[PDB]
Amino acid sequence: YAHSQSLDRLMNPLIDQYLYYLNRTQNQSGSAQNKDLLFSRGSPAGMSVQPKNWLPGPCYRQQRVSKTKTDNNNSNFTWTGASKYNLNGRESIINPGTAMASHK
Amino acid sequence: GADGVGNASGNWHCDSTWLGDRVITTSTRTWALPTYNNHLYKQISSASTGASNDNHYFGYSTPWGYFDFNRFHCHFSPRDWQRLINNNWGFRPKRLNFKLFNIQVKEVTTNDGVTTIANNLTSTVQVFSDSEYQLPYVLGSAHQGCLPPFPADVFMIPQYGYLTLNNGSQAVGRSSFYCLEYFPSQMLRTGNNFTFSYTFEDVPFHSSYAHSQSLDRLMNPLIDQYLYYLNRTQNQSGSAQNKDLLFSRGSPAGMSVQPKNWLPGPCYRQQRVSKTKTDNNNSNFTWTGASKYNLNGRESIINPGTAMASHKDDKDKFFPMSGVMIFGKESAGASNTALDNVMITDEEEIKATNPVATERFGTVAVNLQSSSTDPATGDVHVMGALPGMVWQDRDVYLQGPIWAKIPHTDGHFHPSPLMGGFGLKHPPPQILIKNTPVPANPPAEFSATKFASFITQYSTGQVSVEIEWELQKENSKRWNPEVQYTSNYAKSANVDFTVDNNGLYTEPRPIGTRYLTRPL
Amino acid sequence: PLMGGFGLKHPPPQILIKNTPVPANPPAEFSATKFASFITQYSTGQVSVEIEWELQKENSKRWNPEVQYTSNYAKSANVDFTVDNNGLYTEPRPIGTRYLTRPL
Numbered sequence: 001y002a003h004s005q006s007l008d009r010l011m012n013p014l015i016d017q018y019l020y021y022l023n024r025t026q027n028q029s030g031s032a033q034n035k036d037l038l039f040s041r042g043s044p045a046g047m048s049v050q051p052k053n054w055l056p057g058p059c060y061r062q063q064r065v066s067k068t069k070t071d072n073n074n075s076n077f078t079w080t081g082a083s084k085y086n087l088n089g090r091e092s093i094i095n096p097g098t099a100m101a102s103h104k
Numbered sequence: 105g106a107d108g109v110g111n112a113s114g115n116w117h118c119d120s121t122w123l124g125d126r127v128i129t130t131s132t133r134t135w136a137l138p139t140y141n142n143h144l145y146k147q148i149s150s151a152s153t154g155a156s157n158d159n160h161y162f163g164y165s166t167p168w169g170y171f172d173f174n175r176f177h178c179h180f181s182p183r184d185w186q187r188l189i190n191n192n193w194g195f196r197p198k199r200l201n202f203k204l205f206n207i208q209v210k211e212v213t214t215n216d217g218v219t220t221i222a223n224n225l226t227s228t229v230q231v232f233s234d235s236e237y238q239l240p241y242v243l244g245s246a247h248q249g250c251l252p253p254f255p256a257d258v259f260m261i262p263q264y265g266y267l268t269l270n271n272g273s274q275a276v277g278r279s280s281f282y283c284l285e286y287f288p289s290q291m292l293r294t295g296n297n298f299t300f301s302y303t304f305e306d307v308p309f310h311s312s313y314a315h316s317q318s319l320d321r322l323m324n325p326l327i328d329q330y331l332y333y334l335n336r337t338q339n340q341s342g343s344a345q346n347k348d349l350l351f352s353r354g355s356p357a358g359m360s361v362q363p364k365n366w367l368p369g370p371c372y373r374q375q376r377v378s379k380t381k382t383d384n385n386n387s388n389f390t391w392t393g394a395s396k397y398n399l400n401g402r403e404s405i406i407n408p409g410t411a412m413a414s415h416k417d418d419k420d421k422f423f424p425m426s427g428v429m430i431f432g433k434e435s436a437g438a439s440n441t442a443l444d445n446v447m448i449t450d451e452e453e454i455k456a457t458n459p460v461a462t463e464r465f466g467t468v469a470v471n472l473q474s475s476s477t478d479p480a481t482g483d484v485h486v487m488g489a490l491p492g493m494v495w496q497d498r499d500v501y502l503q504g505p506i507w508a509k510i511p512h513t514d515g516h517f518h519p520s521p522l523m524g525g526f527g528l529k530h531p532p533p534q535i536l537i538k539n540t541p542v543p544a545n546p547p548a549e550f551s552a553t554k555f556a557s558f559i560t561q562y563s564t565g566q567v568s569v570e571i572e573w574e575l576q577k578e579n580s581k582r583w584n585p586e587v588q589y590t591s592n593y594a595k596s597a598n599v600d601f602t603v604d605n606n607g608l609y610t611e612p613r614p615i616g617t618r619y620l621t622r623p624l
Numbered sequence: 625p626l627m628g629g630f631g632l633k634h635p636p637p638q639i640l641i642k643n644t645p646v647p648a649n650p651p652a653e654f655s656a657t658k659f660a661s662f663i664t665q666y667s668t669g670q671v672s673v674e675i676e677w678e679l680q681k682e683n684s685k686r687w688n689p690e691v692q693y694t695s696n697y698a699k700s701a702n703v704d705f706t707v708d709n710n711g712l713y714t715e716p717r718p719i720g721t722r723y724l725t726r727p728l
Contacts, residue, residue, distance in 0.1 A: 006269060051429075
C-alpha cells in the first residue's frame with residue numbers, strides 16, 4: 001500500500017494547537033533590531049513549525065545522478081564519490097541502502 | 105435507551121474513585137455543536153495563500169464535529185493529579201467508557217437583529233465512532249477543543265477536517281477523499297442517547313519516577329575495579345616529554361575514566377535560548393538556526409524532539425529553542441505574546457540518563473594518530489541508537505496529551521509519541537458528531553439543482569467519559585523523605601487552580617509526574 | 625447548638641440543585657475561548673419533606689392545672705397566625721416549648 005497522508009501533514013487543518021513555540025527572538029518595532037522572546041501557538045498557517053509526535057525514517061545519504069547525461073558533473077565518480085562501508089580494511093559500496101525516497 | 109421528550113436520557117457522572125491499584129476517573133461536560141460548513145464538504149489547500157514551500161498542504165473540511173478528551177486534565181482534577189504523582193511509580197489506561205446524552209436540538213431564526221432560538225423536537229443529530237480506523241486520525245496532534253479542565257465549563261465541539269497527500273498546494277493521484285456519510289452512524293432525537301466502550305492495549309507504565317542515581321555514577325565508591333585503562337601516553341621523568349604507555353586500574357578517584365556497561369540516550373542537538381533577553385544573540389534565528397527535518401522537499405522543525413534534559417546543572421534560565429513543551433495561559437494570545445504569558449516545561453529529572461538538549465552528546469576520534477600526525481577530536485551533535493543505550497522518555501503534564509496513534513508503518517522505533525504519553529497501535533477511536541440537515545421549504549415545482557435552503561440549527565448535550573487507570577505503586581526503601589508536589593502554604597491573593605472574581609478557571613503552572621525516586 | 629436545637633454528627637445532608645446551562649447558538653467556526661452565550665432560563669417544582677418525630681409523653685402527678693400556650697379568647701381585629709386583608713402570612717410572637725413542669 002501507499003500512505004494517503006504524510007508524516008508532517010498529520011494534523012487538523014482547521015484547528016489551532018494548545019501548544020506554543022518560540023516564534024520571534026527579535027521583535028520588529030521599526031527599531032531595526034531589538035532582542036525579545038515572542039511565542040505563538042500552532043496554527044494551520046504554520047504547519048512546518050507545529051510540535052509533532054514522530055520523526056521520518058533513518059538516513060544514509062547518497063549521491064544524485066541525472067538520467068540525461070548533460071546535467072552530470074564530468075568525471076568518473078561511481079566509486080570515487082559513492083557512499084560505502086569499511087569492513088576489515090576493505091570497502092564495499094552500500095548498494096540498495098537504507099530505504100529512502102528516490103527523488104523529491 | 106430512549107424515552108419520550110420530557111425524560112432525561114442520562115445523569116451527571118463526574119467523580120474519581122481510588123482503589124489501591126486502580127483509579128477511575130469520570131468526567132461529564134456540557135457541549136454545543138454548531139452546524140459547520142453550512143452542511144458542505146469543502147476542498148481546502150494553501151493555493152493563493154502566503155505560500156512557503158514548507159507550509160503547503162492539500163486536504164478537505166467536513167460538516168462534522170468530533171469529540172476529544174486526549175488531555176490528562178480532562179480526567180484528573182489537580183488534587184487527583186497530585187495524589188497520582190506523589191504516591192505512584194507509574195500508571196496507564198485500561199478501560200474506556202463513553203456516553204452521549206440529553207440531546208437538545210435548537211433551531212435559530214434571526215429576523216432584523218432580533219435573533220430568537222426555539223426547540224426543534226423532531227430534529228436529529230448523527231454520531232458514530234471510527235472503530236475500524238478508516239478515517240485520518242487527528243487526535244494525536246495536540247489541537248484545541250478538548251473537554252474543559254473545569255467541570256462547570258461549557259465547550260464548543262471542534263470541526264473535523266483532514267490532510268491528504270500534497271505536492272505543494274496541489275494533490276496527487278494517490279490522494280484520498282473520505283466522506284463521513286459513507287459510514288453507518290446512529291441518529292438521535294432529543295430522547296435518544298449514544299453509548300460505547302473501548303479497551304486499551306497493553307502499554308508500559310508511564311515512568312512517573314525520577315532516578316536517584318545517574319548512569320555514570322553507578323559503581324561502588326569504595327572499591328577499585330579489576331579492569332585497567334591507558335592512563336598516560338607520555339611519562340613525566342623531568343625529561344620534558346618521552347613517549348611511553350602507562351596503564352592504571354579504575355579507582356573511585358577517577359570515575360570519569362572507569363570502564364562502564366551502558367551509554368546515555370540518543371541525541372539530536374538543539375539551540376540554547378535564555379529566558380532573559382540580554383544573553384541572547386541578536387537577530388531572528390527561530391527558524392534560521394533551528395534543528396529540523398527534510399521530508400520530500402519541505403522542512404519541518406523537529407519540535408518536541410528526542411527526549412533530552414532541558415538545561416544542565418543550575419542554569420535553569422536556559423531551554424532548548426524548540427525542544428520543550430510550551431503551554432498557553434488563558435490570557436495568552438495568538439502569535440504575539442511574551443514569555444510572561446506562557447509556561448515552559450523543565451525536563452530536569454532525566455539528566456541522569458539522557459543527554460542535555462543544548463549541549464553535545466560527546467566526542468569522537470577522527471583520525472589515525474602516529475608520530476607524524478596529531479590525535480584529532482570531533483564533536484558529535486547527532487547520535488542515533490547504540491547497543492547499550494538506555495533512557496527515559498519525555499514526561500507527561502496535567503495539561504498535556506495522553507496518547508497518540510502509532511502510524512501504520514512497515515517499521516518504527518520505541519514508538520513513545522514525542523510530545524509525551526502513550527503510543528497505541530489502536531487508540532480510543534474518533535467519535536464523529538454532526539447536526540442533521542433540515543431543509544427549508546422547497547419550490548412548489550421540482551428542481552434538480554443542489555439543495556441550498558436549510559433551516560439553521562445547533563445542538564447541546566452532555567458528554568461523559570470514564571477511564572480506568574492501572575497504578576504501579578511505589579516500593580521504596582529510601583530512608584529520607586521524598587520530593588512531593590505541594591501548594592505554597594503562605595498567604596496569597598489567589599488559590600492555585602481556581603476561579604477568580606470574574607469566574608475564570610486558571611492553571612498556575614504545568615505539573616509533571618516525576619517526583620518519587622527509584623534507583624537505576 | 626448554642627442557638628438551640630439538635631446537635632448531629634451527621635445531620636440531614638445538603639440538597640444541591642441547579643439549572644443545567646443551555647448554550648445559545650455558537651459561532652459557525654470553531655473557537656477555543658470559554659463559552660459565554662447562554663439561553664437564560666429558570667425552573668419551578670414542588671418539594672416535599674416528611675419527618676417522623678418521637679414524642680416523650682408527660683407522666684405528671686402534679687395536682688393543680690399547668691400553664692398552657694393559649695390564644696386570647698377576647699375579640700380582636702386579626703386572628704393570630706393568619707393572613708391579613710392583603711394576604712400576608714404573619715407570625716405574632718415567638719413560641720417556645722417549656723410549659724409543662726417536671727420536678728428536679
